[PDB]
Each structure stands twice: as C-alpha cells, then as structure tokens.
Design a binder for this molecule. Structure first.
Ligand SMILES: Cc1ccc2[nH]ccc2c1
Ligand SMILES: Cc1ccc2[nH]ccc2c1
Length: 213
C-alpha cells in the first residue's frame, strides 16, 4: 500500500522529512523540555484532517497523553488558521490519558477497536500520537534489575505501535524527552526551532498556525 504523507505545517521540516511524516512508520521526535515536541503533535493533529491537496489525509486522530499536555483550545486555534472548522477538528481527535506505563500499553490495544471501526469510512484514523512515549517508563523502572524489564516492555509497546502503523496505514508520531525515523528538535535564537534527522536542518517558528517557516 502506498505511503501517505502528512504535512507538518512547515515547508522546511516537510522537505527534511521527504514530504511530511509517513504512514506505516513511527516518527519519534527527541528534544529537551520546551523544545516544541508537543506543539508539533498539536499541529499534526490538525494537518492530518486536511484533504490530500492541502497536505493532509482526511484522517481521524487518536491521542495518548501521559503528561496532561493536550490542549483542546490550542487545537481550535490551529484549526481556525489552517482553513478548517475548530469544532469538527476536535470531534475527530479521540483522546485518552495514560495513567501509567501498563495502562499506556493497554490503550494501544484498545485503539485498534476504533481504528477498525473507522477504517473503511471517509475519515479513517491516519495519525496516532503518543506524547510522551517514555515518561512513565522513565519514572517507574528505577533500581537494580529495572533496566532489562523497562526495555522489554518498551520493545513490546513499540512492536504494538509498528503493527498498527503497518496493518492499518497510520502515521504513528511519538515524543521522547531528553522509531523508523528519529528527529532531534531544539530551541534556538529568537525562539526558532531547529530540527535534524538522526542516523541539513529545518527551521521553523511556533505560531497561531501551529508551526510555519
Ligand atoms: C494520569 C491520569 C489520571 C486520570 C485518568 N483517568 C483516565 C486516565 C487517566 C490518567
Ligand atoms: C476514546 C479512545 C479509546 C481508546 C484509545 N486508545 C488511544 C486513544 C484512545 C481514545
């Protein structure tokens, strides 16, 4: 099945990514606190809902939040400035807070039910966000013997995500505070954000349109 490509809102970043973030893939953004990872997530949750000729996939969204950082009003704001209706856009984001890492893993299995339901409708799920992929795993797996167990659980979680991405043609987008594709993000001068691929650089600003050049 052809890979779909979701515009980030930044032409610079889109170019770096080869046209946008890919379906049938997990794109992992890395960066320090305040780098803009969650702003990119909010922007993508809007962009994906655009028609293909405007950089989207006419898609629905599922969002797993581990840090209570999802902001419906930010979504409304971005939607308004991208030519979309803020209420309709929010309606197409299925939102869940993950209580701990085990519940986070279960929510991915739960997501498949809605994915199946919407699959052959005109608004299939096309983006699954996990923000943050690792925050619960970091806080819970501490002490002698914990590392091997943390890593096994995280591997299983990533495998579950890859399966949804590949089986249902979805872009999975995850954040990691300091992957088929790893992107390092950092805040620079004048509040500009700079992105680099791991294993040129794109530059963008955070604005009322989400992100743009
Ligand atoms: C952190 C947190 C708190 C309350 C919740 N209810 C459902 C999920 C969830 C997660
Ligand atoms: C409503 C809903 C149900 C299951 C889910 N899994 C991930 C997000 C999510 C949202």
């Amino acid at each position: 099945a052809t890979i779909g490509r979701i515009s980030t809102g930044s032409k610079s970043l889109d170019k770096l990514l080869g046209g946008g973030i890919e379906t049938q893939a997990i794109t992992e953004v890395f960066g320090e606190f305040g780098s803009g990872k969650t702003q990119l997530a909010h922007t993508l949750a809007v962009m994906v809902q655009l028609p293909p000729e405007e950089g989207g996939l006419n898609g629905s969204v599922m969002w797993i939040d581990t840090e209570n950082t999802f902001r419906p009003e930010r979504i409304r704001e971005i939607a308004q400035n991208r030519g979309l209706d803020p209420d309709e856009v929010l309606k197409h984001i299925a939102y869940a807070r993950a209580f701990n890492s085990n519940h986070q893993m279960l929510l991915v299995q739960q997501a498949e039910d809605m994915i199946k339901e919407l699959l052959n409708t005109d608004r299939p799920v096309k983006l699954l966000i996990v923000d943050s992929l690792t925050s619960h795993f970091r806080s819970e797996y501490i002490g002698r013997g914990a590392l091997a167990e943390r890593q096994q659980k995280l591997a299983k979680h990533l495998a579950d995500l890859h399966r949804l991405a590949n089986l249902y043609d979805i872009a999975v987008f995850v954040t990691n505070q300091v992957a088929t594709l790893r992107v390092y993000l950092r805040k620079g001068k004048g509040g500009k954000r700079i992105a680099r691929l791991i294993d040129g650089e794109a530059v963008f600003s955070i604005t009322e349109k989400g992100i743009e050049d």
